[PDB]
Design a binder for this molecule. Sequence first.
Ligand SMILES: CC(C)CCC[C@H](C)CCC[C@@H](C)CCC[C@H](C)CCOC[C@H](COP(=O)(O)OC[C@@H](O)COP(=O)(O)O)OCC[C@@H](C)CCC[C@H](C)CCC[C@@H](C)CCCC(C)C
Ligand SMILES: CC(C)CCC[C@H](C)CCC[C@@H](C)CCC[C@H](C)CCOC[C@H](COP(=O)(O)OC[C@@H](O)COP(=O)(O)O)OCC[C@@H](C)CCC[C@H](C)CCC[C@@H](C)CCCC(C)C
Ligand SMILES: CC(C)CCC[C@H](C)CCC[C@@H](C)CCC[C@H](C)CCOC[C@H](COP(=O)(O)OC[C@@H](O)COP(=O)(O)O)OCC[C@@H](C)CCC[C@H](C)CCC[C@@H](C)CCCC(C)C
Ligand SMILES: CC(C)CCC[C@H](C)CCC[C@@H](C)CCC[C@H](C)CCOC[C@H](COP(=O)(O)OC[C@@H](O)COP(=O)(O)O)OCC[C@@H](C)CCC[C@H](C)CCC[C@@H](C)CCCC(C)C
Ligand SMILES: CC(C)CCC[C@H](C)CCC[C@@H](C)CCC[C@H](C)CCOC[C@H](COP(=O)(O)OC[C@@H](O)COP(=O)(O)O)OCC[C@@H](C)CCC[C@H](C)CCC[C@@H](C)CCCC(C)C
Ligand SMILES: CC(C)CCC[C@H](C)CCC[C@@H](C)CCC[C@H](C)CCOC[C@H](COP(=O)(O)OC[C@@H](O)COP(=O)(O)O)OCC[C@@H](C)CCC[C@H](C)CCC[C@@H](C)CCCC(C)C
Ligand SMILES: CC(C)CCC[C@H](C)CCC[C@@H](C)CCC[C@H](C)CCOC[C@H](COP(=O)(O)OC[C@@H](O)COP(=O)(O)O)OCC[C@@H](C)CCC[C@H](C)CCC[C@@H](C)CCCC(C)C
Ligand SMILES: CC(C)CCC[C@H](C)CCC[C@@H](C)CCC[C@H](C)CCOC[C@H](COP(=O)(O)OC[C@@H](O)COP(=O)(O)O)OCC[C@@H](C)CCC[C@H](C)CCC[C@@H](C)CCCC(C)C
Ligand SMILES: CC(C)CCC[C@H](C)CCC[C@@H](C)CCC[C@H](C)CCOC[C@H](COP(=O)(O)OC[C@@H](O)COP(=O)(O)O)OCC[C@@H](C)CCC[C@H](C)CCC[C@@H](C)CCCC(C)C
Ligand SMILES: *C/C=C(C)/C=C/C=C(C)/C=C/C1=C(C)CCCC1(C)C
Ligand SMILES: *C/C=C(C)/C=C/C=C(C)/C=C/C1=C(C)CCCC1(C)C
Ligand SMILES: *C/C=C(C)/C=C/C=C(C)/C=C/C1=C(C)CCCC1(C)C
Lengths: 221, 221, 221
Amino acid sequence: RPEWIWLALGTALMGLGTLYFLVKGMGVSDPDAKKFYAITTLVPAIAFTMYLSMLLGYGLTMVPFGGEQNPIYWARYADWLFTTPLLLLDLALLVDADQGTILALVGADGIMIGTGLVGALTKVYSYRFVWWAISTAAMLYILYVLFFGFTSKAESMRPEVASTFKVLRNVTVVLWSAYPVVWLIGSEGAGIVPLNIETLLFMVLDVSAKVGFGLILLRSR
Amino acid sequence: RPEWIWLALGTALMGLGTLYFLVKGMGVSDPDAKKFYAITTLVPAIAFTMYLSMLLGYGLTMVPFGGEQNPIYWARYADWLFTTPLLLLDLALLVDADQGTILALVGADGIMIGTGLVGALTKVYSYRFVWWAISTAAMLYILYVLFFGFTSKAESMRPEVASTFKVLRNVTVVLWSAYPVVWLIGSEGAGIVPLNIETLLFMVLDVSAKVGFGLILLRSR
Amino acid sequence: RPEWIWLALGTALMGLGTLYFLVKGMGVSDPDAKKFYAITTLVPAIAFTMYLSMLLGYGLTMVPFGGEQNPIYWARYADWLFTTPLLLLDLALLVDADQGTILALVGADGIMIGTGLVGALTKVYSYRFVWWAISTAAMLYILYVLFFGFTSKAESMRPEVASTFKVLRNVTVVLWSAYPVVWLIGSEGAGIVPLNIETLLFMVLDVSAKVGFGLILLRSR
Ligand SMILES: CC(C)CCC[C@H](C)CCC[C@@H](C)CCC[C@H](C)CCOC[C@H](COP(=O)(O)OC[C@@H](O)COP(=O)(O)O)OCC[C@@H](C)CCC[C@H](C)CCC[C@@H](C)CCCC(C)C
Ligand SMILES: CC(C)CCC[C@H](C)CCC[C@@H](C)CCC[C@H](C)CCOC[C@H](COP(=O)(O)OC[C@@H](O)COP(=O)(O)O)OCC[C@@H](C)CCC[C@H](C)CCC[C@@H](C)CCCC(C)C
Ligand SMILES: CC(C)CCC[C@H](C)CCC[C@@H](C)CCC[C@H](C)CCOC[C@H](COP(=O)(O)OC[C@@H](O)COP(=O)(O)O)OCC[C@@H](C)CCC[C@H](C)CCC[C@@H](C)CCCC(C)C
Ligand SMILES: CC(C)CCC[C@H](C)CCC[C@@H](C)CCC[C@H](C)CCOC[C@H](COP(=O)(O)OC[C@@H](O)COP(=O)(O)O)OCC[C@@H](C)CCC[C@H](C)CCC[C@@H](C)CCCC(C)C
Ligand SMILES: CC(C)CCC[C@H](C)CCC[C@@H](C)CCC[C@H](C)CCOC[C@H](COP(=O)(O)OC[C@@H](O)COP(=O)(O)O)OCC[C@@H](C)CCC[C@H](C)CCC[C@@H](C)CCCC(C)C
Ligand SMILES: CC(C)CCC[C@H](C)CCC[C@@H](C)CCC[C@H](C)CCOC[C@H](COP(=O)(O)OC[C@@H](O)COP(=O)(O)O)OCC[C@@H](C)CCC[C@H](C)CCC[C@@H](C)CCCC(C)C
Ligand SMILES: CC(C)CCC[C@H](C)CCC[C@@H](C)CCC[C@H](C)CCOC[C@H](COP(=O)(O)OC[C@@H](O)COP(=O)(O)O)OCC[C@@H](C)CCC[C@H](C)CCC[C@@H](C)CCCC(C)C
Ligand SMILES: CC(C)CCC[C@H](C)CCC[C@@H](C)CCC[C@H](C)CCOC[C@H](COP(=O)(O)OC[C@@H](O)COP(=O)(O)O)OCC[C@@H](C)CCC[C@H](C)CCC[C@@H](C)CCCC(C)C
Ligand SMILES: CC(C)CCC[C@H](C)CCC[C@@H](C)CCC[C@H](C)CCOC[C@H](COP(=O)(O)OC[C@@H](O)COP(=O)(O)O)OCC[C@@H](C)CCC[C@H](C)CCC[C@@H](C)CCCC(C)C
Ligand SMILES: *C/C=C(C)/C=C/C=C(C)/C=C/C1=C(C)CCCC1(C)C
Ligand SMILES: *C/C=C(C)/C=C/C=C(C)/C=C/C1=C(C)CCCC1(C)C
Ligand SMILES: *C/C=C(C)/C=C/C=C(C)/C=C/C1=C(C)CCCC1(C)C
């Protein structure tokens, strides 16, 4: 029942992030700047849409495993499924311009979310965590590769990008670790937390990561 | 019942467009020419497949909201979902070669179709138009960005490309405005038109946009 | 019932291919080398995941047309659906660097698998082969274009790449012809083979194509 407040809050917040970014972003940009802007604006857009989809909750109300709906989750996975990739793309793009690197990273990302979804939807009783574990592995890979990202400085311009990246990586890591813990504990893991919590926590992370990173990139640009 | 004539007509027409384009297209092309050819040939291909899928209508016969089937619609959304992107890609490619621009544009496109689909499938009674409205917004964005496309001449070769683009934008705009009106009025909107009409109108636009643009690009190349 | 041995074998085998390739691959690579490595490592990854999904068989146990499950097949199509594209991408990348060429090829690929899936899921009795036929056409196109790939030597470095490609094309063709024959005869075609066979044969091809090509590329690099 409660979910609606959190989700509505999210819809508004994210939507706002989107709009705001369209305005702020636009400005003086053709290449790099516009690339960053577009990439980081699309995210919020998506997230907003999805949030409205989550709030309204279309489709049907069937249970995969529990006594909780399925539209919410599905939506989440769509959100993260496009978001993540794009976000990763942006950050990577700021530093590394290696085809192999990026491609690999986005593929790894792909299976992270995707497999997470697999696990989320698995009907069986105890093996959702098998998938979770694989998701964990993938996530770790993304992070390790981010370690490299930072590490390998190479082609760098102004100092600002370095700092932006520095804060960006911390936020990223944090938020992105939070994801799996919250997932495991609540939502589609064990069910340690009631229900509300899932939505609140997950939304907290969502908005913080997307709008936060958007703002850090706003700071950078 | 009637739908089969329209859809069969479409299957044949589109298929023909595809084949024809394979022949016509092929020729002297490696880079640009081949890029244009491939990009504009794939569309028709897809549309044909989908049209056969629509005509045969696989899956199941369940109703989202009404007393009309669901294979047709779904198919349509797949069609537009790949088509649009590719078409937009081609046109953009002809003028603007800005990563940001293109990416943004295709993302916007993405949510246009996608969200359209969301709205199309929503089970609730009155909120399909909420999604429709968002779809409207997105569409508008695509168009506005096309205004820019034209506007920003910059790097240009022969005069022919300018003219081709000129006719292309008109056709595009027209057809693409028609989409939403027809959608709203018939199919999955209100249901002002019987049923037949949905198929006929939507097909008219389809074939005209894809084969027409293909032919305009045929003219250009 | 039997399927589990084949699928478990596959999970292990493929997983091993993935891991092994992460180790072997990694090494000295930034550009080309890393591109090849990443591209060819992702495949196995995917295949593994999917194989675990196939072995465990989540979702539900409904029949499209027969008395055999649906998770297996679905999984297969996901596997091939990403795999193929990536594999094709890698091979193409080794020779041809033509946007048009590649894009076209991957689009053709796209409909190959995709349409194959369409056919696979069609509920009707006799028209699965219509789709199959279209899939056949597409496959053929991929192969013909590969004929060109070989044919058009152009920009070439060392001799090793030529040989690698030479073995790669043979393997590719072979395996890829095998697919459709096995499909038609067993699984979702007629049902000439019991059930086991489908899994065994299809897995044989899978592992051989992915790990084999991976190894040929390992040889090359
Ligand atoms: C399906 C949905 C749900 C998922 C949506 C995800 C979405 C696909 C992700 C968006 C990422 C986009 C924005 C990529 C951006 C491309 C970039 C603008 C192109 C610039 O181009 C220049 C360099 C190439 O670098 P460079 O080193 O010079 O090499 C290049 C040789 O290719 C050339 O040709 P050659 O070398 O032969 O001459 O930047 C090229 C570097 C990279 C940025 C290229 C990215 C390729 C492509 C878009 C990735 C698709 C990912 C999928 C396969 C995901 C699979 C999911 C799995 C779980 C299965
Ligand atoms: C390599 C990576 C990438 C990973 C590969 C993963 C691969 C993509 C797998 C996904 C396959 C999914 C779609 C299977 C979902 C099956 C679904 C539950 C069953 C459909 O039945 C209707 C369902 C409820 O099931 P129900 O019928 O009740 O099932 C059985 C009960 O009768 C008894 O169950 P029990 O025994 O437990 O009691 O409800 C309706 C629910 C549906 C609408 C669920 C769809 C999820 C979400 C909306 C999809 C997102 C779409 C894209 C953004 C994805 C991009 C992919 C790209 C990379 C290309
Ligand atoms: C679900 C929950 C329960 C799970 C939570 C798990 C949590 C995410 C995991 C913790 C993992 C931590 C330990 C990561 C550690 C990173 C490490 C500090 C970064 C290394 O770099 C250190 C710099 C400062 O050192 P300094 O030497 O000055 O560095 C500059 C040079 O690199 C020169 O610069 P240059 O090279 O550019 O010239 O950064 C200083 C770093 C700060 C920014 C540290 C941030 C604190 C903390 C992690 C925030 C917690 C917030 C959320 C988890 C909230 C949860 C919400 C809940 C309700 C779920
Ligand atoms: C999932 C399905 C249903 C949807 C299918 C849609 C399908 C993905 C769309 C097809 C569009 C394709 C054909 C793109 C063509 C790429 C083009 C050939 C690559 C050429 O490359 C050169 C320039 C880069 O330009 P340039 O300015 O020089 O910059 C580049 C820096 O990236 C490099 O690296 P760096 O700069 O760091 O050195 O052209 C690069 C410009 C653009 C053309 C790049 C496009 C990237 C990628 C393919 C877009 C994927 C879109 C998704 C995320 C959709 C999301 C859906 C949403 C609703 C969520
Ligand atoms: C940011 C953008 C991109 C937007 C994000 C959007 C996101 C992608 C959302 C899509 C999620 C979809 C798939 C949910 C569909 C649920 C479906 C209706 C339910 C499944 O149940 C079987 C259905 C009929 O439902 P039914 O069971 O009757 O439902 C309830 C009744 O019991 C009582 O209903 P009521 O209360 O109204 O009486 O029939 C079977 C119908 C299915 C086969 C429908 C699938 C649609 C179409 C074929 C998908 C295209 C696939 C790709 C081309 C998409 C590319 C995505 C990429 C960008 C990666
Ligand atoms: C669902 C339905 C009911 C909804 C229908 C809605 C409809 C789509 C919306 C109408 C929107 C219209 C008003 C758009 C206006 C565009 C505007 C004219 C273009 C501006 O440019 C004008 C040029 C000629 O001026 P000129 O000065 O010579 O221009 C050359 C210089 O740019 C120098 O050139 P350069 O810069 O290159 O050197 O173009 C002249 C333009 C013509 C090509 C105008 C086309 C007419 C009309 C729109 C066709 C209708 C067809 C379909 C809607 C059919 C419906 C089917 C139904 C059953 C649903
Ligand atoms: C949805 C899921 C299920 C499917 C997943 C499939 C996944 C999308 C496939 C992965 C393939 C990826 C890895 C592509 C790699 C891109 C590569 C690194 C970018 C390098 O970039 C440089 C050259 C461009 O070459 P070059 O000749 O110099 O031209 C370029 C002009 O674009 C620039 O701009 P301009 O020319 O204007 O200046 O390499 C560019 C050449 C090509 C490699 C570009 C590829 C574009 C894009 C990624 C393809 C998407 C495919 C979809 C539409 C599939 C549809 C499915 C159908 C059944 C509907
Ligand atoms: C141009 C190309 C690309 C081709 C375009 C093709 C296009 C993509 C089409 C796909 C549309 C699919 C998803 C439709 C599937 C409908 C499904 C069977 C019905 C859903 O109902 C639940 C089903 C069992 O059906 P059921 O309810 O029993 O049906 C009727 C009975 O009541 C009586 O039947 P009968 O009359 O025969 O007795 O079970 C649950 C099964 C589902 C989970 C099936 C999903 C398949 C697989 C997991 C999807 C992979 C996802 C991605 C990797 C795809 C990437 C796409 C990208 C290119 C973007
Ligand atoms: C489902 C099943 C039943 C269906 C099976 C169908 C089967 C796939 C279809 C057969 C199609 C065949 C006939 C393809 C023919 C290719 C042809 C030989 C290649 C041409 O090139 C010839 C070279 C050697 O000539 P040579 O003159 O020395 O060439 C070097 C110069 O190009 C200079 O070099 P360069 O230009 O670089 O300087 O290659 C010599 C080529 C060998 C590598 C030939 C391989 C043998 C055979 C096809 C293997 C069968 C394995 C599987 C089908 C197993 C099935 C498993 C079942 C249980 C299903
Ligand atoms: C805007 C949304 C963002 C940035 C979402 C990110 C989500 C994740 C990094 C999720 C990771 C997960 C796992 C590692 C395992 C369980 C499933 C997930 C999706 C919670
Ligand atoms: C070959 C097919 C083409 C070019 C199809 C294009 C379709 C559209 C531009 C559809 C637009 C829509 C909206 C703006 C809102 C309602 C849903 C749509 C898909 C009709
Ligand atoms: C690792 C997996 C690989 C390389 C799989 C490849 C699969 C194919 C080439 C499948 C081709 C098909 C047809 C031509 C028609 C029937 C359906 C398929 C998928 C068996």
